[model samples]
Each structure stands twice: as C-alpha cells, then as structure tokens.
Target: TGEEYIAVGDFTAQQVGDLTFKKGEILLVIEKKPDGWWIAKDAKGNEGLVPRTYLEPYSE
Candidate 1:
C-alpha cells in the first residue's frame, strides 16, 4: 500500500522518526500523517516522516 511521488525541495529532519528528502528524488508514500507530515519511504529504503508539501505526485 504505497503511492508514488517526487520531492520538490530538500529537507532536513528536526527529529527522529522523521526522514529527509532531496529535490527530484522519487519516493514511496506509505501514509499521510496529520499536521502535514507523511510517513514515507524513499528509493534508498529510508522510511520516516516527510513534509506533505514537499511531495508532488507524478506518474513514471
């Protein structure tokens, strides 16, 4: 149960359980957590929270 997306900008996590993302990196969204944070996993297999605004959906 995952959705496809891409990161629009780079992000640095402020806390544990939160993940980071870089521009144009493909991601697999696991769940949309509240407060604009989402539980996601990247292509590198890193899983944690990412900003919902930073993720943009794109089909590839």
Candidate 2:
C-alpha cells in the first residue's frame, strides 16, 4: 500500500521516529499516519515518518 510522492520542502528529523527528505526528492508513501504524519521510503531505502504536508503526489 504505497504511492509515489515528492518532497516539496526540506523535512528534517528532529528526533526518533521521524524521517528526513530533501526538496525535490522522490519517496514511496508507505502509510498515512495520524496527525498528518506519513511513513515513507527514500531512494536510499531509508524509511520513517514525515509530515504529510511536505509531500506532493509525484508522477513518472
């Protein structure tokens, strides 16, 4: 249950259970979490929770 998404802004992990993403980076949406958080995996295979607002649907 995943979809492609792109980082519209930089998301920095401030602590544990957080995921980081650089602007324009593509990631896989693993799951949607509560409080606007989402689980995603980056190109390097890193996975964790990130703010849903920082991501946008990506095509191709």
Candidate 3:
C-alpha cells in the first residue's frame, strides 16, 4: 500500500517498510542512466545515497 505526495520536485521520495521520512534524513533516487544517481536532500540539507536501494519503488 502506498500514497502519493505533492512531489516537491519531479523526483520521488521513496518509503519502504517502516523507514519513513524525517526532518534531517537522507535518501536516494535512481536514474535511468547506466550509473547515474540523485542525492535527495531535504529542505534541512541532509545528504545521503550514492545510489541506494530503498528509494526504488516496487510492486508486490
């Protein structure tokens, strides 16, 4: 089960299991390129994910 947000940007902020978003938490968004990535930074400037897995959306 998933819900959609307003998408502050064109990319998405992934949520999986119990790992939800926080004020200063970092996330990653995968790009279609062979080795490209997106480092998702919140309004608070939390940096992480050099191509992480949690940001990927899936169907189960």
Candidate 4:
C-alpha cells in the first residue's frame, strides 16, 4: 500500500493477535487485505491488522 494513515478510533486488543492502538496514532499501511482489513505498522514498530474504517490517510 505504501501509505501512511492515522487511527480515527481507539481500539483495544480483542484477541491475542489483534493490533491495539489509540486514536490519532500514526501507522504505515503495509498491505490491504481482501477482507477490508489493513496490515499496518505502528510508530512503536508493532505490526498487525487494523480495520480500514478506523484509518484515515495521513499527510504531513
């Protein structure tokens, strides 16, 4: 995907593999899943799947 995004909603890990992040957190979009999920890397370097609806394109 090669794009930067910011979380629009706070998410708590619902399961062991869920990616937990807060609103306004910055993330890098690594891939767009077929199921509308996005694989992203957080500023802290944690990588996990996030809902596309929770992210907005980030511009700096």
Q: Which ten-residue region of model 4 has the weakest summed lDDT?
A: 12-21
Rank by lDDT (best first): 1, 2, 4, 3
**Model 3 RMSD in angstroms:** 11.5
TM-score per candidate, chains pooled: 0.84, 0.85, 0.23, 0.82
Give the local distance difference test score of model 4.
Answer: 0.81
Model 2 CA deviation exceeding 4 Å by range: none
Error of 4 at 6 (Å): 0.1
lDDT tens per residue, model 2, 1-60: 588889889878899877778999898888766888888888887888877787889876
What C-alpha lDDT do the candidate models reach, one value each? 0.82, 0.82, 0.33, 0.81
Which pairs of residues collide in model 4? none
Per residue, candidate 3 scores C-alpha lDDT tens digits across 1-60 of 122121222333364311235432334342332444344333344433333333443232
Q: Write the per-residue lDDT of candidate 1 for residues 1-60, one digit (tens) a residue.
A: 588799988987788988778988887788776888778888787888887787899888
- Of the two candidates 2 and 3, the one with more favorable lDDT, higher being better, is 2
Give me the runs in candidate 4 sitting further than 4 Å from their true place: none
Model 4 lDDT at residue 16? 64
lDDT (tens digit, per residue) of candidate 4 on 1-60: 458889989997787655888989887787777787778878787888887888999776
Weakest ten-residue segment in model 1 by summed lDDT: 29-38
